[PDB]
């Protein structure tokens, strides 16, 4: 008699004559909000700042900074495999990501499955030297080996022109994969979208938190020229993440265990 229902449900007389009266107020959002938010798939298509990247921290001389990043944003807190290092509760040090908690990072570990394309923007703010004509470029990796989040510099200021060309051929920009380029002095914004290519895969594990140490199959290499002179020390790249149009999440299996804390002192 509806007595061990896994979803419950047995309505007993409560304190209202009219059942659900706020659905009968048609012109409610002409008075208070101006808009109504019904789905998360509509709200996941607002871009949000994830993380910044400084190209004059890897090599020396005039070189070509390359960054292998996952297509899905990395997660916010105390990783065991984090790209930064914070001061923990034992007055020591531990790996930590100083990235933001996006809505995609929030919603994804509560679902089983995940599939879809993912959109990025690379903004290139900061300072720069007056002698730059660099090209910012995004190029996708293969879908067999997920590369972790890594940073590499390719030197371009050799005496041999062939040993410069051999450094430009160590790059994913030289490959048959999809490449988007732009000049930094004229547009400085990529606005790319990573499609969901797969080796016969219908989805992947949406509850996979270790993106900075493993990566996923939608990784992208971001490449930008940098020189070793001053005022390029403040040259950086800002990543804005969002969600493509064929994106979906699987079955909801409950919220994960969450943790609330501010950012520590970066050491």
């Amino acid at each position: 008699d509806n007595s061990n229902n896994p979803v419950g449900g047995n309505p007993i007389d409560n304190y209202g004559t009219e059942h659900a009266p706020l659905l009968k107020e048609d012109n409610q959002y002409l008075v208070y909000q101006g808009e109504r938010i019904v789905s998360f798939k509509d709200l996941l298509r607002r871009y949000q700042y994830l993380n910044s990247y400084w190209p004059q921290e890897t090599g020396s001389g005039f070189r070509y900074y390359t960054l292998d990043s996952p297509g899905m944003p990395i997660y916010r807190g105390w990783d065991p495999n984090g790209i930064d290092q914070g001061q923990d509760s034992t007055a020591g040090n531990s790996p930590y990501n100083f990235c933001s908690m996006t809505l995609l990072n929030y919603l994804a570990p509560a679902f089983v499955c995940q599939r879809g394309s993912l959109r990025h923007k690379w903004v290139t703010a900061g300072a720069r030297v007056n002698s730059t004509a660099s090209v910012l470029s995004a190029t996708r990796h293969g879908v067999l080996f997920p590369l972790p989040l890594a940073e590499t510099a390719h030197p371009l200021d050799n005496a041999l022109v062939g040993d410069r060309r051999s450094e430009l051929q160590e790059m994913q920009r030289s490959r048959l994969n999809g490449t988007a380029i732009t000049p930094v002095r004229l547009n400085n914004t990529l606005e790319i979208e990573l499609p969901y290519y797969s080796i016969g895969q219908r989805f992947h594990a949406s509850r996979f938190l270790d993106l900075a140490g493993t990566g996923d199959t939608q990784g992208v290499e971001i490449a930008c020229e940098i020189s070793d002179g001053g005022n390029d020390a403040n040259y950086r790249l800002d990543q804005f993440v969002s969600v493509g149009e064929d994106f979906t999440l699987g079955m909801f299996v409950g919220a994960p265990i969450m943790y609330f804390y501010n950012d520590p002192t970066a050491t």
């Binding site: 659905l23 012109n27 959002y29 101006g34 019904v38 789905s39 149009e245």
Partner: protein
Amino acid sequence: EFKHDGLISKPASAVAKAADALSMIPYIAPYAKATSMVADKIGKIARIFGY
């Protein structure tokens, strides 16, 4: 779908008095995309669900 100036022809954000069908569930046809699909196959107001 991919059409020229599609944001003008939406109700796009809001009340749109007949858009108080927020209590309706979206039905997805068995191989439906998001673009050239259910935003025209459910109704006019299927763009508040993100389609």
